[PDB]
Subunit: 229 residues, 2 copies
């Protein structure tokens, strides 16, 4: 038995990102997996890291330090319920899939805020705390990204550089850091410019990949993988 | 004369980030520059890219596409006023300094949302009209970042890899994309664990750099610079 959380960041259900999220739900459900979706825009998920994230009273209210405050609130069971609700989904999951369009070589801010606020010290990491000592080892993570640019723009000598270059802060600096084994990314290059036939091709690569996702090994989430040889 | 915009992303005025912002204000003010600060947390700046960012009739109300609809809204002058407010600041500035703690090898979500919402098509870039042809050509940008990890940790052989590696989405994918020339980053390493001696020194180093900022030349904002050969 396998549990999957899909963290989904697109405003429009009729989008290509929506299609990809829905075929994931459909295929993983068909397999018998337990599936949960965090539809961040529908949730009006809060992105900002603020003192509202700790309930009651602070470890030092004279000088607010978000990292220390949330670390202490996680230990005293004092985080805001939107955070802890996401933490439970994560804790239960065997696989976390992030489904998003590439905004400025990264995640949309609403999803950045989910990372910033959900992946707190004590839960995902400790200081010291991290990479293999992070707290989500044993779990799989996978970034399913759509891009505005064509594949060849994301080549080494392409204007955008290699797609791997922009994955670093997300796969390594965030997911690896917290202990996830990182599955190879799903990159759906320039679906908006693509034909209905290229778009169906991309959706089926993904449904077909999902059929065998539990047979994948994580990538080696190394600087050599992103930047070499 | 010179105009400077500081986009500042920390919750606590008494923080080290706060110190760095304040010393920038004080030195650039002393020089006679015109200075504006967008204190995003104090502004409760909206980070989410939503349909609330456009006030008129949508171009395609059946299938919402944020990029398309904000592009059209920019041209029609129908974007939300918070966006327009920040666009004016950027338009006027000669130099934009981003002052923030590193969250997940990137900017805090509040600041990611500023990038996502303020730097829209028509304003910051066109297609064509990006990278060296971006619409903010002639302006300078600088990242002033604080880190949890020590300097040794952000080297090629340190735990986090080289600091330049995480700068790529920001410097290249966002600022260079919009036409900015990019000044060398100011990275203040591990202030929380430094002595007050050391913290004072890092503050004073930044103030001293600012004394001669207008004599600096930008980096070559290329793959080679960020990653090597
Ligand atoms: Zn890694
Ligand atoms: Zn560049």
């Amino acid at each position: 038995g396998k549990k999957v959380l899909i963290v989904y960041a697109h405003q429009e259900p009729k989008s290509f990102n929506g299609s990809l999220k829905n075929v994931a739900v459909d295929e993983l459900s068909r397999q018998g997996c337990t599936v949960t979706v965090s539809d961040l825009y529908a949730m009006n998920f809060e992105p900002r890291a603020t003192d509202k994230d700790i309930t009651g009273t602070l470890s030092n209210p004279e000088v607010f330090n978000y990292g220390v405050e949330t670390h202490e609130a996680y230990k005293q069971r004092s985080l805001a319920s939107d955070i802890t609700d996401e933490q439970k989904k994560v804790r239960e999951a065997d696989l976390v899939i992030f489904q998003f369009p590439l905004y400025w070589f990264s995640v949309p801010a609403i999803l950045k805020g989910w990372m910033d606020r959900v992946l707190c010290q004590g839960f995902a990491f400790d200081i010291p705390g991290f990479y293999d000592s992070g707290l989500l080892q044993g779990k799989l993570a996978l970034l399913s990204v759509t891009t505005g640019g064509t594949a060849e723009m994301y080549t080494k000598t392409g204007v955008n550089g290699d797609s791997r270059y922009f994955l670093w802060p997300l796969q390594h600096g965030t997911l690896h850091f917290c202990g996830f084994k990182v599955l190879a990314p799903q990159i759906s290059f320039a679906p908006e410019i693509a034909s209905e036939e290229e778009r169906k091709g991309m959706v089926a690569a993904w449904s077909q990949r999902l059929q065998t996702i539990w047979k994948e090994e994580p990538i080696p989430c190394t600087a050599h993988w992103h930047f070499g040889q």
